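Standup notes, structure subgroup. Blocker cleared on the chloride ion input:
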Amino acid sequence: KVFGRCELAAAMKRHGLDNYRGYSLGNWVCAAKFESNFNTQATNRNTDGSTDYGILQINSRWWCNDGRTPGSRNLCNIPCSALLSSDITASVNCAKKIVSDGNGMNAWVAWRNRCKGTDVQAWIRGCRL
Ligand SMILES: [Cl-]
Ligand SMILES: [Cl-]
Ligand SMILES: [Cl-]
Ligand SMILES: [Cl-]
Ligand SMILES: [Cl-]
Ligand SMILES: [Cl-]
Ligand SMILES: [Cl-]
Ligand code: NA
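Run returned:
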């Protein structure tokens, strides 16, 4: 599924991400846009052999099982294929564990380089929320 900007903000709000660990909704929409272009089926392979999956590009080295990342963990206790669903529930539940891990949203390279310190409220402007 390819989400619209406001469609995705509403879905994230209903799943409890607005001000989760102090990050306003616009931070989460900004991260999704530059990680996946709002596509739940996005994958990307890394140099180390791990793969990033879904709307928030969650990595198989730590967070999910894909059957081909030797010596990796599965901290969200899910197959990586669950993160490519049209239903964002698994991705949102896993993202809550990541953002709690000590580095906040700096875990997402595109958030640190393209969203942090910007007017992120722009990402939910005009939306009925
Ligand atoms: Cl957009
Ligand atoms: Cl915001
Ligand atoms: Cl594995
Ligand atoms: Cl594990
Ligand atoms: Cl699993
Ligand atoms: Cl959903
Ligand atoms: Cl933080
Ligand atoms: Na893994």
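Discussed briefly. The helical segments are 5-14, 25-36, 89-99, 109-114.
Next: hand off to the docking folks.
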